[PDB]
RNA sequence: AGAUGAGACGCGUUACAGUUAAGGCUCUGAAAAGAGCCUUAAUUGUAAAACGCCUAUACAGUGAAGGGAUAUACGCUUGGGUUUGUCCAGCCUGAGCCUCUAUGCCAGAAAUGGCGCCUUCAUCGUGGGUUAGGACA
DNA sequence: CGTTTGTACTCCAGCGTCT
DNA sequence: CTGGAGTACAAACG
């Protein structure tokens, strides 16, 4: 009777297979699932916000340019230049201008100031009030509509859509007063909490009946405070927690960033259990728990498989009855770095703030005088190795403090970057870490066995360096993270870094050390 | 005790062009030094920030009329684009519908009204959606 | 003897406030 | 962070 145990946890997960008829342990290990982080969806959303904001800005500039060319203010006129230069800084409008407003922000102005400047610029440009109000509407116009009321939806519950806490507050406060020792005052406290004209009499209850502080905190939270978040209300479990009618509805995939680690568990399950073992019962309810149950009954080839509810994690897995994951080379990941690099005359350069460079990077700056002032300022202050300069250290200023804030910028040269990583998209130049997708081994003439890199097809028309390939017969092609053997060696090796002579790793028994062997001497396992 | 999602505000980066300041080099002058080129920094303007894939039976603007909780959609059901070697998440969207979910701003105590918004028509144009994230090959 | 690949070493990567 | 860059150093085949 083979039993599979899942010790699912947050950072680590134990896996074990035990035969319960003899207490014989046949398989056990522990692992992590989390990649680098699955919170790079936050950086994806930040880039999505930057991209959509830039698209909206380009869209509005296009529309306002079209309208002003329709009126007659061509790009030669000073009126067009004045209003069109103002359109790049609209100013915020969520906060209405009236000491507090001046101490709030020091840049971006405000929408009313900007549109007052538009009124001034167009009354200097002989415009009518119709044209001025149309330009005012173009500045105030929304292009991508603000739809953020019910976007994500906690859904209908067979156990464990749903409405906001904003709209069903009466049910929550009733759930608070459900466990009170007084009956006739329940509806009175209901009328007291929900009415803002009856706010004062609620505080009498906490001294009259000596309730717990948690109860008082909950009542004050319901008192027009906890307005955010969705409750669990649906057609079922409106007010109760009855566990009847199991498996009434299907299960959907609404739990983002948890699928990643659940299928990371199921990857080693599929790779190490199903080809070799047959399990009669699996033991590990939450949405992820239900999803994981459905995925094991999908993968095991049995829709009715019984699934029921740091070496100590592996021990707990054995009682219930190494290996890290990481990736950035997939098709879903970033082609190239976010901040573009200057690539002139074969020299790779980037501006940086003076306040960012630290003591370990003394002599990378191009300009000599500011380099010297940087190192004397390093010895002037306590800013030793690894510390970036502060604004208080910027109070002893560098040359020509900026108009907007007390910093200064210098060019610098970037190491760890070569001509093979350069791609140019439009006018920009970025570096990439996905530029190799495979190693093509060629043999030609008398048997000259040599290898080339397969450049990435998505970027192949954008590389600055032409892709070197002479003619030959392609006999072999490797990819990243493959199993590979070495000519003249008995062990099995795995590729960590590829290109020319790929960097290969021991599949077992390594201690962090690496070794390189050319792809000519290489063959898969 | 966190989840992912919508929309902006800005700072940073890159390209091209302009102005100013400092330094170096070169030509010339009788000389003071005049001029030209380069470098670095400040500042100003414009443009780019996935590659791509799909869409013109689409998208967008203007004008008129009607509707607007009895209704619409950020909702439900079922399809489509992103989509690929295969399946998805997220976002956008076609048709029908209101079981679940949500419904903005101004005024009027309030009933309610006016804006935003949706639909139809006319006219004008080329624009629009999604792409830095996963999993199995 | 004169090249030619394999090894250590150092370094590289967008960031704030709001509703 | 992972996938890779340049750079100084070394031992081996042609």
Structural domain count: 5
Structural class: alpha+beta
Query: Quaternary state, please?
Result: monomer
Order of helix and strand elements from N to C terminus: EEEHHHHHHHHHEHEHEEHEEEEEEEEEEE
Rg is 33 Å
Helix content estimate:
25-40%
Shape: flat
Largest sheet: 5 strands, mixed
Number of helices: 12
With strands numbered from the N-terminus, the spatial order across the biggest sheet is 3-2-1-4-5
What is the CA–CA distance across the termini?
34 Å
Number of strands: 18
Q: State which percent range the strand residues make up.
A: 15-25%
PDB class: immune system/rna/dna
Keywords: Endonuclease, Binary Complex, Effector, sgRNA
Assembly: tetrameric
Entry title: Cas9d 6bp R-loop Seed Complex
Report what the structure shows.
It is a single chain. The protein is of the alpha+beta class. It has five domains: 2-37 and 257-320, Nucleotidyltransferase, domain 5 (2-Layer Sandwich), CATH 3.30.420; 40-140, no CATH class; 169-222, no CATH class; 342-419; 435-524, no CATH class. The protein is 29% helix and 17% strand. The strands form five sheets. Strands 3-2-1-4-5 form a five-stranded mixed beta sheet. A five-stranded antiparallel beta sheet has the order 17-16-15-14-18, with no helix packed on it. A hairpin with a 3-residue loop joins strand 11 (436-444) and strand 12. The protein is flat. The structure holds three DNA and RNA strands. The PDB classes it as immune system/rna/dna.
């Amino acid at each position: 009777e083979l039993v599979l145990g899942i010790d699912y946890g947050g950072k680590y997960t134990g896996l074990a297979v035990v035969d319960r008829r003899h207490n014989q342990v046949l398989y056990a290990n522990r692992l992590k699932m989390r990649d680098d982080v699955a919170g790079i969806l936050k950086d994806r959303r930040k880039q999505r916000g930057i991209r959509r904001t830039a698209q909206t800005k380009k869209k509005r500039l296009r529309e306002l340019k079209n309208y002003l060319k329709s009126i007659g203010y061509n790009e030669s006129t000073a009126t067009f230049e004045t209003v069109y230069s103002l359109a790049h800084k609209r100013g915020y409008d969520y906060a209405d201008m009236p000491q507090e407003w001046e101490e709030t922000k020091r840049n971006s102005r405000h929408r009313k100031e900007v549109v007052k400047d538009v009124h001034k610029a167009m009354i200097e440009g002989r415009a009518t009030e119709e044209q001025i109000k149309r330009v005012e509407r173009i500045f105030n116009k929304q292009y991508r509509p603000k739809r953020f009321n019910n976007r994500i939806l906690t859904k209908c519950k067979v156990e464990d859509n749903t409405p906001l806490r904003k709209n069903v507050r009466d049910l929550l406060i009733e759930n608070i007063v459900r466990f009170f020792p007084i009956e006739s005052e329940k509806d009175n406290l209901k009328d007291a909490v929900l009415d803002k004209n009856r706010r004062e009499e609620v505080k009498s209850f906490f001294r009259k009946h000596k309730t717990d502080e948690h109860i008082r905190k909950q009542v004050y939270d319901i008192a027009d405070n906890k307005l955010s978040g969705r409750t669990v209300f649906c057609k079922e479990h409106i007010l109760e927690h009855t566990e009847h009618s199991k498996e009434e509805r299907k299960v959907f995939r609404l739990a983002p960033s948890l699928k990643t680690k659940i299928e990371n568990v199921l990857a080693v399950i599929k790779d190490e259990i199903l080809p070799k073992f047959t399990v009669n019962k699996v033991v590990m309810a939450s949405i992820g728990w239900r999803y994981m149950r459905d995925r094991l009954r999908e993968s095991a080839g049995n829709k009715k498989l019984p699934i029921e509810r740091t070496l100590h994690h592996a021990l707990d897995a054995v009682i219930l009855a190494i290996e890290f994951k990481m990736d950035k080379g997939s098709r879903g990941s970033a082609l190239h770095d976010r901040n573009p690099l200057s690539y002139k005359k074969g020299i790779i350069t980037r501006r940086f703030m003076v306040t960012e460079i630290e003591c370990g990077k003394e002599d990378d700056v191009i300009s000599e005088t500011y380099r010297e002032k940087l190192k004397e300022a390093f010895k002037r202050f306590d800013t030793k190795k690894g510390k970036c300069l502060t604004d208080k250290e910027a109070k002893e200023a560098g040359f020509c403090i900026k108009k907007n804030e007390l910093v200064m910028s210098l060019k610098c040269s970037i190491k760890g970057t070569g001509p093979g990583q350069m791609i140019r998209i439009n006018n920009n130049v970025f570096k990439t870490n996905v530029h190799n997708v495979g190693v093509d081994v060629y043999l030609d003439e008398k048997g000259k066995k040599k290898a080339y890199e397969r450049k990435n097809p998505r970027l192949s028309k954008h590389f600055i360096e032409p892709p070197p390939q002479p003619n030959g017969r392609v006999s072999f092609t490797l990819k990243r993270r493959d199993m590979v053997t070495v000519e003249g060696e008995d062990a099995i090796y795995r590729i960590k870094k590829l290109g020319t002579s790929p960097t290969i790793e021991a599949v077992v028994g390594s201690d962090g050390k690496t070794r390189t062997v050319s792809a000519t001497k290489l063959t898969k396992a």
